[PDB]
C-alpha cells in the first residue's frame, strides 16, 4: 500500500478491505491511508482483508 | 447474451421498465472516477472533468464505469442492464484514477451538476469528515431540485457508534446502505441515524473498463440503484420535486429491521413510482 500522496480525503466507496494495527477494518486503501495520516503514522497495516 | 444483474429485479426496476419508463430525458450525473464512454454498453452524452490531466469521458480506475452501468447500462444483446437504461448519462470526473480526490474537486462537480440542470446526482464516494464547502454545495443542489444520492459508507458497525460518512450524512443527501441478494445487510454497510434506505451492494455485476464487466462490493454499488430508481420515478412523473421523489423512495421501501442498520429498508421502485 502506497500512502505517499495522502491526505486525499474523498475516496470511492468500493469495499476492498484492509485490516489495521488498531483491529479496525478499513473499507479500502484510500480509507486506510487517510486514517494513517490522521493517526499520525501510528496506524499501520496488519494485513489485506477484514480483521 | 444480455444478463440482468440481480439488483434490477430485487428493487423491482424491471416492473417499472415494463410500463415503458426507463429514464428517458432524465439527466443523471455520476460524480466519480470518470466513465469509459467508449464502452459498448454505455452512452455518455456529456460531462466535465475537475481532475487535472484527465478527460471526463475516460476512466483509469474502473469504479465510475461500474457505478454508471448500474444506473444506465444499455438495453441490448450484450453485457448488463441498468436500472434506468434510457437515462441521459453525464460523467463528472471528481476522483483520479487511484480513486481518491479532494473535497474541492467534489464541490466543483456538484456545482457543475446544479448549473447544468442535472435531475439526479450520484456520489459513490465519501470521506470521514465534513467540509462546509461540501455541505453548502449539496444543500444548494437539493434546494434547486436535484435528487442527491450517496453511498452511506463501508465502515461497518461497532456497538452504537455512528459510521455514516460525508456527504451521505448531510440531510440534503440520501444515504444508501448495502444489502445482498438475500436482502440481508452487508457487514461493511455503515450505520446510524442518517441511514435512509438500502439497495443491492454485495456482488454487483456491471460494466468495467476496457469493454468488459466486473463484480464489486460496496455501498458504492448500492447508491446507483437508488439514483437509477429516482430517474425511473421522474421518467414516469416528470413534474415531481426532488423532495417528492425522495419521500416516495423512503416511504414505500420494504422494512428489513431496525432503522439504525437498515433505514426505511430496501427500495421498491415499483411502489415508489405508483
Ligand atoms: Ca446491455
Say if residues B70 and B178 touch (Cβ distance below 8 Å): no
Experimental method: X-ray
Count CA within 13 A, CB hemisphere, residue B210.
2
Say if residues B13 and B272 touch (Cβ distance below 8 Å): no
Angle formed by the axes of helices B219-236 and B63-72, nearest 10° = 30
Residue spans of the domains in chain B: they are: 1-274
With CB atoms and an 8 Å threshold, state whether B218 touches A31. no
A15 sits in which H/E element? none
Report DSSP state, residue B95: S
Which CATH homologous superfamily contains domain B1-274?
Answer: Peptidase S8/S53 domain (3.40.50.200)
Tell me the backbone φ, ψ of residue A33, rounded to 5 degrees. -65, -35
Q: How far is the CA of B188 from the centre of ligand 1 (A)?
A: 29
**B168 in a labelled binding site:** yes
**The domain containing residue A28 runs over which residues?**
1-51
Q: How far is the CA of B208 from the centre of ligand 1 (A)?
A: 12
Catalytic residue set of B: 32, 63, 220
Q: Which is it for strands B147-151 and A45-48: parallel, antiparallel or unpaired?
A: unpaired
- Distance, in Å, from the CA atom of B256 to the CA atom of B268, rounded to the nearest integer, reads 12
Say if residues B177 and B152 touch (Cβ distance below 8 Å): yes
**A46 to chain B, minimum CA–CA distance in Å?**
17
Q: How far is the CA of B196 from the centre of ligand 1 (A)?
A: 30
Report the Cα A30 to chain-centroid distance in Å. 6
**B37 in a labelled binding site:** no
With CB atoms and an 8 Å threshold, state whether A15 touches B188. yes
- Distance, in Å, from the CA atom of B133 to the CA atom of B167, rounded to the nearest integer, reads 11
- Distance, in Å, from the CA atom of B145 to the CA atom of B17, rounded to the nearest integer, reads 24
Task: Give the total number of structural domains in chain A.
Answer: 1
**B41 in a labelled binding site:** yes
Closest-CA residue to A26 (of A8, A45, A4): A45
Q: List the grid coordinates of B219.
A: 455501498
Centre a 10 Å sphere on the Cβ of residue B210 and count the other Cβ atoms it contains. Answer: 10
- Distance, in Å, from the CA atom of A21 to the CA atom of A9, rounded to the nearest integer, reads 20
Angle among Cα B120, A15, B147 to the nearest 5 degrees reads 10
Angle among Cα A18, B33, B47 to the nearest 5 degrees reads 160
| Ion ligand 1 — residues with CB < 5 Å | B 2, 41, 74, 76, 79
Q: CA of A19: which chain B residue's CA is closest?
A: B155
Of B105, B125, B156, the CB nearest to A13: B125
Name chain A contacts of B186, Cβ cutoff 8 Å.
15
CATH code: domain of residue A18: 3.30.60.30
Say if residues B51 and B36 touch (Cβ distance below 8 Å): no
- Distance, in Å, from the CA atom of B266 to the CA atom of B50, rounded to the nearest integer, reads 33
User: Residue B207's beta-bridge partner residues?
Assistant: B213
Amino acid at each position: 500500500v502506497d500512502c505517499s500522496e495522502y491526505p486525499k480525503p474523498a475516496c470511492t466507496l468500493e469495499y476492498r478491505p484492509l485490516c489495521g494495527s488498531d483491529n479496525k477494518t478499513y473499507g479500502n486503501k484510500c480509507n486506510f491511508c487517510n486514517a494513517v495520516v490522521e493517526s499520525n503514522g501510528t496506524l499501520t497495516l496488519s494485513h489485506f482483508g477484514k480483521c | 447474451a444480455q444478463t440482468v444483474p440481480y439488483g434490477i429485479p430485487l428493487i423491482k426496476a424491471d416492473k417499472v421498465q415494463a410500463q415503458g419508463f426507463k429514464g428517458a430525458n432524465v439527466k443523471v450525473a455520476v460524480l466519480d472516477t470518470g466513465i469509459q464512454a467508449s464502452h459498448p454498453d454505455l452512452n455518455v452524452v456529456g460531462g466535465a472533468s475537475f481532475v487535472a490531466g484527465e478527460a471526463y469521458n475516460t476512466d483509469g480506475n474502473g469504479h465510475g464505469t461500474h457505478v454508471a452501468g448500474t444506473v444506465a447500462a444499455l438495453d441490448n444483446t450484450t453485457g448488463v442492464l441498468g436500472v434506468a437504461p434510457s437515462v441521459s448519462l453525464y460523467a463528472v470526473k471528481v476522483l483520479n484514477s487511484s480513486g481518491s480526490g479532494s473535497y474541492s474537486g467534489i464541490v466543483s462537480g456538484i456545482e457543475w451538476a446544479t448549473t447544468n440542470g442535472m435531475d439526479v446526482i450520484n456520489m459513490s464516494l465519501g470521506g470521514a469528515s465534513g467540509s462546509t464547502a461540501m455541505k453548502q454545495a449539496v444543500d444548494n443542489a437539493y434546494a434547486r431540485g436535484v435528487v442527491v444520492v450517496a453511498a452511506a459508507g463501508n465502515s461497518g458497525n461497532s456497538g452504537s457508534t455512528n459510521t455514516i460518512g460525508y456527504p451521505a450524512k448531510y440531510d440534503s443527501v440520501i444515504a444508501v446502505g448495502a444489502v445482498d441478494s438475500n436482502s440481508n445487510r452487508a457487514s461493511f454497510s455503515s450505520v446510524g441515524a442518517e441511514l435512509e434506505v438500502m439497495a443491492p451492494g454485495a456482488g454487483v455485476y456491471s460494466t468495467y473498463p476496457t469493454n468488459t464487466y466486473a463484480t464489486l462490493n460496496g455501498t458504492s454499488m448500492a447508491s446507483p440503484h437508488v439514483a437509477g430508481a429516482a430517474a425511473l420515478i421522474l421518467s414516469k412523473h416528470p413534474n415531481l420535486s426532488a423532495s417528492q421523489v425522495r419521500n416516495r423512495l423512503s416511504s414505500t421501501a420494504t422494512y428489513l429491521g431496525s432503522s439504525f442498520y437498515y433505514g426505511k429498508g430496501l427500495i421498491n421502485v415499483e411502489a415508489a413510482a405508483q
